[PDB]
Amino acid sequence: ATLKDQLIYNLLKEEQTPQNKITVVGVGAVGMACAISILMKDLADELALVDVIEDKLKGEMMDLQHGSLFLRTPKIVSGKDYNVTANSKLVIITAGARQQEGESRLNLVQRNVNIFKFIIPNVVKYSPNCKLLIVSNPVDILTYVAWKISGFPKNRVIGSGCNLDSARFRYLMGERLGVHPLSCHGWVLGEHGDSSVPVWSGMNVAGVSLKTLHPDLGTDKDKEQWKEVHKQVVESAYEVIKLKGYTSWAIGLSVADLAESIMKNLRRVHPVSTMIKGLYGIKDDVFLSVPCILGQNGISDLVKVTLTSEEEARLKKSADTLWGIQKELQF
Amino acid sequence: ATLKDQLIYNLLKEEQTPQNKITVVGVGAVGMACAISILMKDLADELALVDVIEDKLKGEMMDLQHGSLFLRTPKIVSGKDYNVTANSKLVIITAGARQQEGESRLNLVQRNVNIFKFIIPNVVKYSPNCKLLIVSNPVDILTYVAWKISGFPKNRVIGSGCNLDSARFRYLMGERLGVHPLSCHGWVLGEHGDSSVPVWSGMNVAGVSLKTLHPDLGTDKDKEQWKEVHKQVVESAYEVIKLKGYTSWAIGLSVADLAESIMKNLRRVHPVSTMIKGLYGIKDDVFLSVPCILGQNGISDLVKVTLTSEEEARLKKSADTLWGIQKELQF
Amino acid sequence: ATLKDQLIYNLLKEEQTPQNKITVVGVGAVGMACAISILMKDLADELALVDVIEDKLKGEMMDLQHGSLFLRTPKIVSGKDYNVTANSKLVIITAGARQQEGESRLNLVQRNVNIFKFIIPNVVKYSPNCKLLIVSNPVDILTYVAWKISGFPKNRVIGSGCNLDSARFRYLMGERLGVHPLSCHGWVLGEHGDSSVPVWSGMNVAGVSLKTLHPDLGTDKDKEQWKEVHKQVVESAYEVIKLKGYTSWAIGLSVADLAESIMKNLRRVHPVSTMIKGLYGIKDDVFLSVPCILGQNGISDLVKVTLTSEEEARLKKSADTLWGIQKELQF
Amino acid sequence: ATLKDQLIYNLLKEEQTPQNKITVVGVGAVGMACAISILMKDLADELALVDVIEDKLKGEMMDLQHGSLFLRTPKIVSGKDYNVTANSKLVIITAGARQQEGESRLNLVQRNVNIFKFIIPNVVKYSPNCKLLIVSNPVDILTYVAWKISGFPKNRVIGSGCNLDSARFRYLMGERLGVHPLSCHGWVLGEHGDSSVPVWSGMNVAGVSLKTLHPDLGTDKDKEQWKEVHKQVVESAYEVIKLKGYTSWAIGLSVADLAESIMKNLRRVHPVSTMIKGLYGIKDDVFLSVPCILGQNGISDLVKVTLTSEEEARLKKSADTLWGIQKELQF
Ligand SMILES: NC(=O)C1=CN([C@@H]2O[C@H](COP(=O)(O)OP(=O)(O)OC[C@H]3O[C@@H](n4cnc5c(N)ncnc54)[C@H](O)[C@@H]3O)[C@@H](O)[C@H]2O)C=CC1
Ligand SMILES: NC(=O)C1=CN([C@@H]2O[C@H](COP(=O)(O)OP(=O)(O)OC[C@H]3O[C@@H](n4cnc5c(N)ncnc54)[C@H](O)[C@@H]3O)[C@@H](O)[C@H]2O)C=CC1
Ligand SMILES: NC(=O)C1=CN([C@@H]2O[C@H](COP(=O)(O)OP(=O)(O)OC[C@H]3O[C@@H](n4cnc5c(N)ncnc54)[C@H](O)[C@@H]3O)[C@@H](O)[C@H]2O)C=CC1
Ligand SMILES: NC(=O)C1=CN([C@@H]2O[C@H](COP(=O)(O)OP(=O)(O)OC[C@H]3O[C@@H](n4cnc5c(N)ncnc54)[C@H](O)[C@@H]3O)[C@@H](O)[C@H]2O)C=CC1
Ligand SMILES: NS(=O)(=O)c1ccc(Cc2c(-c3ccc(F)cc3)nn(-c3nc(C(=O)O)cs3)c2CC2CC2)cc1F
Ligand SMILES: NS(=O)(=O)c1ccc(Cc2c(-c3ccc(F)cc3)nn(-c3nc(C(=O)O)cs3)c2CC2CC2)cc1F
Ligand SMILES: NS(=O)(=O)c1ccc(Cc2c(-c3ccc(F)cc3)nn(-c3nc(C(=O)O)cs3)c2CC2CC2)cc1F
Ligand SMILES: NS(=O)(=O)c1ccc(Cc2c(-c3ccc(F)cc3)nn(-c3nc(C(=O)O)cs3)c2CC2CC2)cc1F
């Protein structure tokens, strides 16, 4: 018989399920950044990639496979068929349409909704017990959409939300203070992006409230213009998009961080997008970022942050906006 | 005074040199793959990025910076000016021209040589004691060019060479055997790419020579066509380029692996491109991949692999080709 | 209500089964070396400790728990009762007695057998699907004992075996060559310790057979005395026992390496102790180290090393020794 | 010539200075816990061990060396002579005596002082530019002693201090809240151990002050007895000492955490023991733990925590205690 059979005696033909499997749907720059970050943090024993562009998908898959010598994830697979995604613990959706010239925002949102209508049922068929982590924008709306289509309980449908926005905030805060972002604490809540809410009262280093040291923190009156930090959380994303065309690395790392908490059941707290009806004064079925405890069953718990009247009003405004958009969408 | 000054008492204003600094020149897909792989393996305390496209460079830099919370490399910098590269231990060149329609190979090679004529003197000015790791293709020729321009001793000028080719080989070998590539041993030497030489005699698992088990290994007569494995080492690269347009992930991981050996002085053995005159029968100043011991002073030693007459002839043919191309190039 | 309930809204009131649980039985120096190594490679989401000495057990557990901030293993538990071990994927046995005044080694072996008669049934009750990794000495005999008491198929009963011995060999080989042990290839097979067999023909760097370069490799007359390398594999262990009283760190790291391959399903090849009847000429039910493919279902495959007549005779001699001891033991 | 010379061509005949060297003085349980933690986080390219007990020292060194295959620290050395420590970036002192029958704690403190009188001059001769990290107890006093004997500026003399105490606090807080210690924020300052000060006002999750939610936090009358958390920070250490005889693992991990910040220049904030005269109302030359920014030049900056009158009084009391002990010690 063969060289293989001369070299190797096989006892065991038992099938084996993947035990720590992650799927990434959508292998654009964001999806691949998520994939490489996950691979290099050894979060999965199997990584599955899905796209509709078959050549891109296969080529990306093969490129990762060629680096297997340098990795500790023994199985990397891909396909347009969702059977490759079977038995995933965690499925990350980074699939999206490209805005065309002369296309409205609303049309693009609806094109992304329609992509989700095809993706989510297929994911659910093959991984009924998975957690869904939604990265695709508009992320708060598409997390709601994924929830409604999947039929999953709300603990298993999580939007990356303001995890990245909060990471940018801690980055910017660290630059101003000369401290590593790990030691700089501050929370951006609500909607990902423009309408995000910096919670000034929780901003601290070593448990020291910046707001109590500096009462003008977060106001227009501030000599030091600390509001500019939050403004830059928003503008820095626009800046990266202008300079290189898109963002990928930061979101990839942030998603790997959330994945770590889920896959290893860490019960760390992250600002992610969750079904917030009945809390913080919100009365409609919408997803907004608040600090959530993440582990193996998704969101098990959330932190009830004390907001100023102004902060709360901004969240309710966001919720009204999201409800309005949600009802003018089609499904 | 300021909130910073209220929060933080500064004692120490001493300047501080970077102690474990790496530079990547050329932030295309390869350069960025190298950067992310290095960042996620904590190989540097400072990463510097250089390109000629200022917007791309800045946007990439900012995108990595936004993920700082998730990293243990506290300083990421960039610029077109090489003063940002000062005091690097290791400088990785991934800078390259794009082939235009109707452009010869030779013209492209010369365009890459001319890029090196601008890069290498600038690198050397600011990091005279660095190791140079050349990734740009044609890698064997451009490693020779970097050596000649830099004036560095040959131990400090290293071409990524067949490190990636050998990684692909061990990947493919592992697929055939059902074993992790880490446990599958085999060496591809000589030129990166088409003319690479698989050394059949060193192919083993657990110290068991495949050639001794299967004497037809590497021949045309082989029922099992193990030559196809090496053919696929070549074709798989062309395949990835066809499918996704380029390769990035595998090379990025392979470069991070070489960087690990250098930065941590591991004295591991890797198939990299080194000045091979006077060895394996070669009589001209050319760079080819052989197994080299890598650490803090670059290539300190190399392994003398016993080659068949045929293997040796293929290397000498390669050396003659490289010498011929080298003399028809301009510097 | 409580501060917890004021801070935290609970979504989900669920039990939570451990997904990547490892148990260490025996928290002496070897057990705790295994524990810390596993904790610092993030191989488990839950670690369970068992001993008969309650105070030591509890104190060790608490000491690890106090380092939780610095680890990514969210649940560390301990008890005398094996219910704390329930649903382990991997159970590592490092439990044993200490040789008393006037006690033969064989008397001690029987006391260790009797320890296993208490441990193994308890482990099996609470983790019927686990892999068993036996570390306690005499390791080859006690792996057989664990197999017989457990009733487990042979893929799921693994002795740490010569993984450590082979690591020592590659260390010593690296000292002689000035190369990292990772790049120095060589296998020690058979029994852990004194009777271990160095396979000279597999010794290589970069696929270059040392035996072919140096035909006297492994002979007594060798100018360079390379047999001393294997002798030192044995004597170095006795040396550490003499100088420090025991060994712990190297075995801890070796066991973490095996655990990595199992928990991450890597299908790497390791020289571990497996039920070898019917292979390598062995005709009795014994455990000896040969190169095995390790993954999530334990030992899936064996590499068939080509041995000299003498190497094979040494394995069969070992098998006859183990069979003789196994028959004169009481169970 | 030799098999080495047949296998390997030497390019470069150079000495090689260590670039990222760490020394551990005192290879008891705490020293070796520090060593293994540092080795498994790849913080050093060379580790040097020192003790006065030669056999134990050599045996421990050899045991680590046998695990080299599984590590990425290529050089591990040991000796009684401090020439093995030359050119260390970081030197960690874990050396100490054991309390004898009829011996006061103060008598023991003086014996530990006398140990430092021998150690520190020797460390300084061979690594005049190192940072000193003092772990030996009484840690605050012995950090002062190391400072006085060394003549080093205060940025380069660091006591492990309350980094461990704060880790215990966050562990216990996490047990009460059902959240990972990483997401539970809270500071223990002042002296390591009994007299440590919990700063109630900094206790938070997600920037939410527990003190503001629960005003009785830190009072004796508290319904929920949150003072018990701090009491347990102290008692849990006594508990581990009572149950196991000593503590090692948590301190090992805490020291590796400090070492990480220094070796990688992270500028994270840690509660470590620093020369605090002129701050927090302290008027004598003593070392107490406050939140310090740690990097490659040791302590670069201090965070100025807003303390209650009572918290500040407790620090000053500690300073008066330390000053009194320091004056009645002989050197
Ligand atoms: N939540 C956050 O913080 C951020 C999220 N994003 C979002 O991530 C999304 C992806 O971003 P990029 O990679 O830059 O976009 P991209 O357009 O490069 O990639 C999208 C990918 O989705 C795939 N796709 C489209 N329809 C599909 C379907 N039915 N099934 C599977 N795949 C499908 C495309 O074929 C394409 O490869 C975008 O919506 C972007 O806004 C971007 C950065 C931050
Ligand atoms: N040795 C190996 O195993 C392999 C090496 N490669 C090589 O890596 C090179 C880079 O590959 P890609 O990122 O795909 O190409 P790319 O064209 O996307 O990026 C090249 C980058 O170099 C920059 N550049 C050009 N001139 C420069 C200058 N004077 N200074 C600084 N930067 C300059 C460009 O501006 C551009 O961002 C190519 O030559 C490619 O063949 C690709 C994969 C494997
Ligand atoms: N396979 C290999 O390469 C190596 C194996 N070893 C073996 O590891 C074993 C443990 O070594 P050490 O930690 O040095 O010895 P140790 O005597 O310090 O620790 C053994 C522990 O076993 C526990 N124990 C005894 N009976 C038990 C029971 N019924 N249930 C649970 N725990 C029980 C003891 O109470 C004790 O805490 C020994 O047999 C030693 O020879 C150590 C060196 C390397
Ligand atoms: N800062 C903190 O949070 C903690 C500090 N510790 C302290 O760590 C110290 C060491 O603890 P253990 O390992 O349990 O004690 P140990 O007594 O087992 O180890 C101490 C080692 O110091 C060595 N030694 C004594 N004199 C020396 C000299 N002149 N030169 C070099 N080495 C010398 C001994 O020979 C011995 O091997 C103790 O003072 C202990 O209290 C331990 C717990 C936590
Ligand atoms: N709360 S919500 O679901 O209704 C919602 C509405 C609108 C947006 C805007 C938006 C879109 C977006 C793309 C496509 C659409 F069809 C609609 C919105 N993408 N996107 C990106 N962010 C990043 C990054 O790196 O942070 C890169 S792109 C952003 C944020 C913008 C950079 C500040 C976000 C958002 F969550
Ligand atoms: N010994 S040498 O220096 O003279 C030399 C000559 C020719 C080539 C061909 C070549 C070029 C190349 C690009 C530009 C030029 F101007 C000339 C050659 N790139 N390149 C890539 N490799 C990869 C990858 O992932 O392996 C991606 S692209 C390849 C190899 C091809 C895929 C098999 C390589 C080589 F080393
Ligand atoms: N094939 S077998 O199962 O029948 C068998 C028989 C005898 C021994 C001898 C033995 C014992 C031993 C302890 C207790 C007994 F009751 C019997 C034997 N322990 N032990 C240790 N090794 C280490 C280390 O670090 O390598 C530390 S201790 C050794 C190996 C010796 C140092 C080289 C090993 C062995 F596998
Ligand atoms: N501020 S100071 O420098 O003056 C000072 C004085 C007294 C002590 C008490 C002390 C001693 C001690 C050992 C020997 C002496 F000679 C004096 C004191 N050790 N030690 C340990 N801690 C641990 C652990 O794991 O936390 C293990 S032992 C402790 C703390 C106690 C368990 C909570 C600490 C302290 F920092």
Main attributes of the structure:
homotetramer, Rossmann fold, L-2-Hydroxyisocaproate Dehydrogenase, Chain A, domain 2, three-stranded antiparallel beta sheet, 10 helices, 13 strands, globular, binds 1,4-dihydronicotinamide adenine dinucleotide, binds the ligand NS(=O)(=O)c1ccc(Cc2c(-c3ccc(F)cc3)nn(-c3nc(C(=O)O)cs3)c2CC2CC2)cc1F
Explain the overall architecture.
The structure is a homotetramer of 331-residue chains. Chain A contains ten helices and 13 strands. The first copy, chain A, has 331 residues and is an alpha/beta fold. The first copy, chain A, is globular. Chain A has helices at residues 3-7, 29-40, 54-65, 105-126, 139-150, 163-177, 210-213, 227-244, 249-263, 309-327, and strands at 8-10, 21-25, 46-50, 75-78, 90-93, 131-134, 157-159, 184-189, 197-205, 208-209, 268-275, 287-295, 298-303. In chain A, 40% of the residues lie in helices and 21% in strands. In chain A, strand 3 (46-50), helix 3 and strand 4 form a beta-alpha-beta unit. In chain A, the strands form three sheets. Chain A has a six-stranded parallel β-sheet with strand order 4-3-2-5-6-7, sandwiched between helices. Chain A has a three-stranded antiparallel β-sheet with strand order 8-9-10. Chain A has two domains: 21-159, Rossmann fold, CATH 3.40.50.720; 162-328, L-2-Hydroxyisocaproate Dehydrogenase, Chain A, domain 2. The relative contact order of chain A is 0.13. At the A-B interface, helix 1, helix 2, helix 3, helix 6 and helix 8 of A face helix 1, helix 2, helix 3, helix 6 and helix 8 of B. The site of one 1,4-dihydronicotinamide adenine dinucleotide has 28 residues of chain B, from helix 2 and helix 4. Chains A, B, C, D: It is an enzyme of class 1 (oxidoreductase). Chains A, B, C, D: The modification N-acetylalanine is found at residue 1. Chains A, B, C, D: It catalyses: (S)-lactate + NAD(+) = pyruvate + NADH + H(+).
